[PDB]
Amino acid sequence: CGYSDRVQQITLGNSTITTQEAANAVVCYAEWPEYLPDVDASDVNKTSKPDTSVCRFYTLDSKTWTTGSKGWCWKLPDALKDMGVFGQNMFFHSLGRSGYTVHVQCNATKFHSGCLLVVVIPEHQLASHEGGNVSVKYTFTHPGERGIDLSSANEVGGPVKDVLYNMNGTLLGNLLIFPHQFINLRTNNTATIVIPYINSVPIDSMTRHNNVSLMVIPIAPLTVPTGATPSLPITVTIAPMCTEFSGIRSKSIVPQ
């Protein structure tokens, strides 16, 4: 033996991520992602498994962690909708199912302090910022790889952006019932969460429905040492896993 729980390697396709100050990997509800079995299947079409071209790590854009920063939310598969062959099969097909490996980067020094809550939420239905029976419009729940900055302003047709109330009326402290992992700068620099396909249908449309949402939330505020720049980068890298596509057609057009 002599190995570490800290030093991990995830290889998927032609992409490889190494980490040396990891904590563990979280496997959501103790379940690895799989392909759709015949006993659960309903759609008669033979599914497409493009595995090497689509089950690979895609790196999202980086987010600046400041002291006054609130948090960021990403929707899946919406974040990976312009990313290579996966996003192309996402629009050319009417159906599709996918699991994910999410790896969130944030490295610092031993003088730094701060803690992030990386959490995956199944069916994270957002609340409108106006209340009542107001709905959230399509483009505000489908931002792409840019995600939702929760420290931004209220905008018409969009969701509420209070990080405390989790954008759905539940408090932030009870968000640990969902599959979660911390990034503590004294301990951790990465978080790995492996998501299976969680739905009440065997296979679903990947453009009108987001199965899970990924929230990176600073619980403890960022404290840089004296004279350091008051900023750290956060990077999100998501890889599809066991991805099937069914019902190929002529690329449906989504709003914007």
């Binding site: 302090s113 640990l176 019932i177 911390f182």
Partner: protein, 236 residues
């Protein structure tokens, strides 16, 4: 005709009655089950998961800062936090433990309290987390809390202490609603030595408090909770 006699309680509607009734949709075949992960069979399964305690309650509006217990450097013999252990009220009220606890009238068992240190890796501290069993007051210095159920926590590479609150009670069950006879005691933390920050780092570091239930936990006599209400019905 079989000669029968109808009892008192014929024609009553008891909401908790578990009988059979005719199916309004005969020969209906429902959608077959597929495998969905995360299946819940019991609410005693999901209260053994830690969730954060909003314990820094000293804010006029609810904040993320309410989950952060402040921790000051170069302090000696002082107190970090303190609360009573009414788990259906106070800091525990909005917690996933204490929101399922208020669905039931009686609780019994051991609690599992955690603390996670989120300061710099070059910093060090020693803290003493103490549970005061009921009968005595809330401890007002470190020597008072030292005489109870306590652990000394050395802060290092492992960032969490887990100090269970063991079941110290004469009666076998406590009311989930706060009751003086079935009170649970007090919980506090103190500086064992100090907090030492590394050079070129100033300010406050923070603690993160968690609570969950042990497998020792019991929960009976289902009731309605006080955490939600409405004055009018909702429309679509």
């Amino acid at each position: 005709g079989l000669p029968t006699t109808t009892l008192p309680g014929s024609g009553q509607f008891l909401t908790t009655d578990d009988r059979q009734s005719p199916s309004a949709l005969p020969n209906y075949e429902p959608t077959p089950r597929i495998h969905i992960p995360g299946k819940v069979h019991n609410l005693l399964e999901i209260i053994q998961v830690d969730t954060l305690i909003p314990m820094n309650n000293t804010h006029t509006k609810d904040e993320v800062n309410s989950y952060l217990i402040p921790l000051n450097a170069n302090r000696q013999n002082e107190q970090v936090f303190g609360t009573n252990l009414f788990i259906g009220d106070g800091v525990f009220k909005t917690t996933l433990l204490g929101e399922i606890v208020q669905y039931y009238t009686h609780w019994s068992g051991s609690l599992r309290f955690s603390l996670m240190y989120t300061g710099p890796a070059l910093s060090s501290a020693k803290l003493i987390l103490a549970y005061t069993p009921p009968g005595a007051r809330g401890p007002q210095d470190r020597r008072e809390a030292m005489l109870g159920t306590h652990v000394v926590w050395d802060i290092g590479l492992q960032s969490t202490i887990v100090m269970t609150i063991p079941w110290t009670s004469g009666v076998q069950f406590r009311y989930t609603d706060p009751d003086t006879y079935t009170s649970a005691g007090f919980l506090s933390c103190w500086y064992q030595t100090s907090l030492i920050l590394p050079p070129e780092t100033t300010g406050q570091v923070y603690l993160l408090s968690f609570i969950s239930a042990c497998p020792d936990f019991k929960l009976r006599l289902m009731k309605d909770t006080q955490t939600i209400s409405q004055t009018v019905a909702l429309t679509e």
